[PDB]
Write a protein that binds this ligand. Structure first.
Ligand SMILES: [K+]
Ligand SMILES: [K+]
Ligand SMILES: [K+]
Ligand SMILES: [K+]
Ligand SMILES: [K+]
Ligand SMILES: [K+]
Ligand SMILES: [K+]
Ligand SMILES: [K+]
Ligand SMILES: [K+]
Ligand SMILES: [K+]
Ligand SMILES: [K+]
Ligand SMILES: [K+]
Ligand SMILES: [K+]
Ligand SMILES: [K+]
Ligand SMILES: [K+]
Ligand SMILES: [K+]
Ligand SMILES: [K+]
Ligand SMILES: [K+]
Ligand SMILES: [K+]
Ligand SMILES: [K+]
Ligand SMILES: [K+]
Ligand SMILES: [K+]
Ligand SMILES: [K+]
Ligand SMILES: [K+]
Ligand SMILES: [K+]
Ligand SMILES: [Mg+2]
Ligand SMILES: [Mg+2]
Ligand SMILES: [Mg+2]
Ligand SMILES: [Mg+2]
Ligand SMILES: [Mg+2]
Ligand SMILES: [Mg+2]
Ligand SMILES: [Mg+2]
Ligand SMILES: [Mg+2]
Ligand SMILES: [Mg+2]
Ligand SMILES: [Mg+2]
Ligand SMILES: [Mg+2]
Ligand SMILES: [Mg+2]
Ligand SMILES: [Mg+2]
Ligand SMILES: [Mg+2]
Lengths: 126, 253
RNA sequence: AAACGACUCUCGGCAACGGAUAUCUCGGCUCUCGCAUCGAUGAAGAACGUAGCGAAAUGCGAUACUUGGUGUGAAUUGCAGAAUUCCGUGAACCAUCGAGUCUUUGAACGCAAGUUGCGCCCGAAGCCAUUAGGCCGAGGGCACGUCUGCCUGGGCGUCACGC
RNA sequence: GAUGAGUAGGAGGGCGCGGCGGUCGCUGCAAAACCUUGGGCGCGAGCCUGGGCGGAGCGGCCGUCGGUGCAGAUCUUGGUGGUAGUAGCAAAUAUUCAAAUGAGAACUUUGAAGGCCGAAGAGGGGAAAGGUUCCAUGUGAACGGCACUUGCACAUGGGUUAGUCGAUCCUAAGGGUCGGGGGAACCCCGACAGAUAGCGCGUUUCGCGCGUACUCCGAAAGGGAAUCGGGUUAAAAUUCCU
RNA sequence: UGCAAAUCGUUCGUCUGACUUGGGUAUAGGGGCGAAAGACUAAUCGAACCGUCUAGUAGCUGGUUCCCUCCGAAGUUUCCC
RNA sequence: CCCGUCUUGAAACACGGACCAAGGAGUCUGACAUGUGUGCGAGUCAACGGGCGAGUAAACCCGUAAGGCGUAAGGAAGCUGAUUGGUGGGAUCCCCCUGAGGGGUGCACCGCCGACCGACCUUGAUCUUCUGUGAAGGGUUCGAGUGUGAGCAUACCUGUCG
RNA sequence: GCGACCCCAGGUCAGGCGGGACUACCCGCUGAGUUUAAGCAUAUCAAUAAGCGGAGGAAAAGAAACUUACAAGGAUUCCCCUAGUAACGGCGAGCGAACCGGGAACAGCCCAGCCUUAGAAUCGGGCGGCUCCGCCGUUCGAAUUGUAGUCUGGAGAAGCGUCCUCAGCGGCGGACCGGGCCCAAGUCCCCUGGAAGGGGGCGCCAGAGAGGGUGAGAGCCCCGUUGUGCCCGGACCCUGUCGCACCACGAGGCGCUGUCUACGAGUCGGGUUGUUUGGGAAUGCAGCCCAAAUCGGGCGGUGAAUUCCGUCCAAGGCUAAAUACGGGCGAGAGACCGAUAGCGAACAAGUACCGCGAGGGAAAGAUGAAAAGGACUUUGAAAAGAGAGUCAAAGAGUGCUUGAAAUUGUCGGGAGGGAAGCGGAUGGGGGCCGGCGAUGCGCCCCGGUCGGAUGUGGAACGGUGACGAGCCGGUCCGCCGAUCG
């Protein structure tokens, strides 16, 4: 049960906040869980999805497909993966949007900030 | 309740005037001007599109009620008495087939439970878990417009736990279990004792609260310590067993 | 010979016309709570501009859908192009604010106004001109009523000293 | 056992809609809603159900609440008929022939013929008013009350060049004001209750002499400094070129 | 149910003046303006137009939404601008 | 005979109605009143406020000589302030006898007549601060009074009124 | 002619101040009528709407020239009650306070005047310094037609005693506020589905089962939610502690006094007129006329005279809190509305559009999970049609969830001498209905399975009684007989 007086349980307000979120907030909202191996290694559960991250889809028609993320379309709330595509009536190839909550991160692109965030997340879990 | 009412100015934000008779149209006031779809249309009428409703709702409606304290106490005592009748508790929808006895009074050690898992284990031990499981399984989305009015989920009522020690940690341990409600013995609420106005709430008493009941509600002979001058009401019938009276030796002779 | 057909009407399937019904909702209405912050240091409002590709809405002011600091940490995206030591003074139609820019107006202030109309003053730099002045002009000034102080003045208004 | 009429009107018991507190359920093995010469229950309000469609929710029961039940109000908003392929297309004398283009020509363009406006015009320019309608190219739909290949429509581009033409300057009827006088105040009168703006001469920039309380707005027809030929564009010219 | 919320055809009055007309300017609602018709004052005039008081008041006109069941009238008395 | 309406009288040569969908009109509030349900009862009402408390607009608790209504009325007012009944019917119950009987009991309600309080009138021993008191005795007068309380809170329909 | 002062004039002189904007609340002015009175004029509407001004975060009011008559209360404000009362009113319609009493909050103060005269001890500006919201030095100016200091009626001045009280700085914390970072649990097995988030099974977290998103009802997929921990910044105010100097000249506190004791004028008050109020021989306010006093003045709800009594001290000023709040910025909620509803506006809505103008003012939301937004063939001038393709679905094809009625076309059935429709009764034709309409039961023979006492033991249990004894009793299990059902 919510107790903080500065947070609202209103459905309308929560929906408005989610659908008007700026890019910086959308990045956090577009988080995905880490794989079992990565979760065990880093002691972290979920991370924001990045461009060059390796991802395995776990839901939908592409449940077995995996690859490298190639675009994070925050405006559309979807990511794009290397070979997860389809053919139009024209015959050309287009990427299929996949929601990050429905995929699993198998390999992270590590930098100084990424390592700092991983350490910060692991510290709280202890 | 919180008051509701339409805007007092709604349907009157226009300078519309009636055309009068002689134009082969109704006498309802009509919007002035021209060059727009609104010009010439009716206004101010409860039967008019975009008009004011009949008898617009106002905030100074009598929302609240002032029931005499004695009647409130009567109702609370009646609900408490009904909670001790297993037939009534069953009739109210509670699964009490496994409870050792009614009223269900448990050891005061339950008041020191801190974790929800331990609370669940205690509920299983005392035989009240099936009611909580029934309450959890009934979780569903409320039908109708209420689901978009911030009342999205409804479910059945589980056991009500009454404790006698202020600041007991069981309140935190039990509050996350669906259907389970907790209340202090000194501030019992009729709304929880008779949900929906129906008697026979399933209640779990701690020993301390059960002991305090006598000092709170007194008795027929002496008065209550916590309710100044209050005495429990007496029924119009001393013995409600009608068969014992109708089939007695005195009557049947 | 009032049969077949046409017309009218009627009943049913299908197809039209129209947008009712049901299910929704980043909107409204109502109640409650917290705070006190516009303006001559030029407000509110009004005009005109500004994007690679925009008319409106939103934003902004010739530094013009943004400059700068800080936070966050890899986008924006309808299309095209360009960045980014992407293990980094570092992407973002991201967030937030301390630095900065902020056109014509408007209480609107040199005079006006159906006029980008009509005046006066100061002056950086530059041209040749030399203890002399000229051309040009960046840029800035010139409303009203008042308070304090000041400068310059008027009147036998009240006096005094001399002639 | 007896008995049965009912407008105005009163009351009782019930049916139906949407919420709230409870309770019992249904639903992607298909909810709501809607459709149906399928079937049944009730005197009735209504209710239950087959089949279809629809594709995400809904219902029963006990209490309780309400913006809760339509055939009418020349009722409101929206939608749709008969009228009806009907009334109408008729003022301003008038068109015809051949060719070109085009899928399509009575209506576009070229040529020829026959007519009209007849200089107080159906010609050639301006003022106000409009604001791109101006010019070139192209054109699906709409519009141009028949039609269009077309155009004052639509789409993409282009176009308005001044020392001499105007505004700008002056003042007209009048307008707006300082001070003063009124006014609770918004405001009223308007040079009328007043130390006016300033203007000339010589200069150590100071002196001398004049100085009747508005040096403001108000005319693209009143007054008024100055341009003419010749040529030039798809569209500008006393403005561009000489 | 017009080309037109005053127009069209023929006819008609006056036509150097109390003539006709453009622009500027002044007079604004119980006010203006009127060679005077209660005329005109933006298709509005015996008191314009716009917003508000305003959901103005009406003993008067019109409507007033489900079912069955039971009971079931009055147009007469007195008083009242 | 076409519905709705006004009407003594409508199928009317009486008005509205071309057709369909959706919307569309005795409500909310304040003061009273009868009725009914509920609590308590010579009382009743904690929600002005306070203590708290579902981490909480609820619920719970709190009336000191608080306050409202009731518990006493009659007079313009000064002011005074209920001596507590009788009787005819009458429900229920108890006795004797089985008659439409007799005796006892006599609530509710109704009829009749006293008594008490007060306005008014009348009356006057004794005391008394000299204007008060009140032994006795009253009245075709008047009251929304007394004669062993019946109210207060709250819910709803109906009715008058803003 | 010079000089001093006074009044005034000009300065683009040096440095400051003001105008205007917003509306929910707040302060001042001005000010109706509709309406009610069943007419209407006083009254009511209303000390309201409209109009003209002025502030803040609140405003305004505020420290008795009060309330009362008591055994007395004690600034202002607000709530309950007083009370629909006293009063007012063609005493009609109607209107209508205050004190006491109970609560919320509480807070008191500053001036003018006689009182330096051994010297204006006061203040502003320039300039120069400093630990710079200020202090110091110097110089000009203001001011004696009076700046400082003391005093304000509760007092106070002066005098004498008492020895009672009074003097900052800096550090570290707490309190308040605003922010930042991390931290629980499944996406395991099977099925239906385009997609599980649905059904079934097996697990887990919970001081987190508020809420939202993601391809359908998701506690454990994601954001969040609960509870800790850590980090940053304001407010210099309140509060605890610590380190150092802590000076009583002077000023206050208390007691005494054969002394003084200064207090607001065209103001109060009165007459009259107008307005307003419940204020009634006149409640307040305002114009005009008269016009005070200091052993006095105002009030004491009936005008006047006389004698007492009670209570305060006007005509100068400041002041937080309790209270108000349809505007501004920022939050939380709802038995509210759900696109003809709800604000006029869910959308480039105060927009398009209309009016010379003041002003008036709409309509308009829904493809799909994902554009995967329909390639290509063919006919056509083209719009498009016929095939084909995408999708779970086009029976979802960009005004794209669903798609009622009025109304219309087509096909099929039927009827029709100047309406049609309708009530009741049959009939013809059609349509529909198999709970539309049964096939069991009893007695015997054969075969197959399952069990068979009133006997004897065990397990648990019940009726009654007294949730004791005693009596009675059923279910299940194992055995010897019985040989039945
Ligand atoms: K048909
Ligand atoms: K920035
Ligand atoms: K000019
Ligand atoms: K239910
Ligand atoms: K059906
Ligand atoms: K209900
Ligand atoms: K062509
Ligand atoms: K003046
Ligand atoms: K003047
Ligand atoms: K001119
Ligand atoms: K030339
Ligand atoms: K008028
Ligand atoms: K009448
Ligand atoms: K009628
Ligand atoms: K008719
Ligand atoms: K009482
Ligand atoms: K009397
Ligand atoms: K000085
Ligand atoms: K002084
Ligand atoms: K004094
Ligand atoms: K005084
Ligand atoms: K006076
Ligand atoms: K006195
Ligand atoms: K609307
Ligand atoms: K569909
Ligand atoms: Mg709908
Ligand atoms: Mg409603
Ligand atoms: Mg001529
Ligand atoms: Mg052209
Ligand atoms: Mg002046
Ligand atoms: Mg001039
Ligand atoms: Mg009392
Ligand atoms: Mg104040
Ligand atoms: Mg009372
Ligand atoms: Mg008080
Ligand atoms: Mg100084
Ligand atoms: Mg679905
Ligand atoms: Mg999580
Ligand atoms: Mg139809």
């Amino acid at each position: 049960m919510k107790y903080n007086p500065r947070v609202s349980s209103s459905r309308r307000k929560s929906r408005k906040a989610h659908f008007t979120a700026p890019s910086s907030v959308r990045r956090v909202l577009m988080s995905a869980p880490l794989s079992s191996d990565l979760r065990t290694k880093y002691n972290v559960r979920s991370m924001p999805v990045r461009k060059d991250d390796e991802v395995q889809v776990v839901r939908g028609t592409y449940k077995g497909r995996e690859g490298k993320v190639v675009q994070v379309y925050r405006k559309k709330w979807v990511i794009h993966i290397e070979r997860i595509t389809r053919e139009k009536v024209n015959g050309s190839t287009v990427n299929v949007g996949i929601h990050p909550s429905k995929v699993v991160v198998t390999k992270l692109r590590l930098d100084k900030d990424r390592k700092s965030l991983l350490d910060r997340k692991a510290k709280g879990r202890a | 309740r919180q008051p509701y009412a339409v805007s007092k100015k709604a349907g009157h934000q226009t300078s519309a005037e009636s055309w009068g008779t002689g134009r082969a149209v109704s006498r309802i006031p009509r919007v002035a001007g021209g060059g727009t779809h609104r010009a010439g249309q009716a206004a101010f009428g409860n039967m008019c599109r975009g008009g004011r409703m009949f008898a617009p709702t106002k905030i100074w409606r009598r929302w609240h009620r002032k029931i005499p304290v004695n009647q409130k106490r009567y109702a609370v005592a009646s609900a408490i008495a009904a909670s001790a009748v297993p037939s009534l508790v069953l009739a109210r929808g509670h699964r009490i087939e496994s409870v050792p006895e009614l009223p269900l009074v448990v050891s005061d050690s339950v008041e020191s439970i801190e974790k929800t898992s331990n609370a669940i284990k205690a509920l299983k031990q005392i035989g009240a878990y099936p009611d909580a499981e029934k309450a959890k399984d009934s979780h569903a989305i409320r039908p109708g417009k209420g689901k978009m009015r911030n009342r999205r989920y409804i479910s059945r009522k589980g056991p009500l736990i009454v404790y006698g020690t202020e600041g007991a940690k069981l309140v935190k341990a039990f509050r996350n279990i669906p259907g389970v409600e907790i209340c202090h013995v000194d501030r019992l609420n009729l709304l929880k004792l008779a949900p929906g106005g129906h008697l026979g709430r399933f209640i779990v008493w701690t020993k301390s609260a059960y002991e305090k009941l006598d000092g709170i509600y007194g008795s027929f002979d002496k008065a209550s310590e916590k309710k100044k001058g209050y005495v429990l009401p007496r029924p119009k019938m001393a013995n409600a067993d009608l068969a014992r009276i109708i089939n007695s030796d005195e009557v049947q002779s």
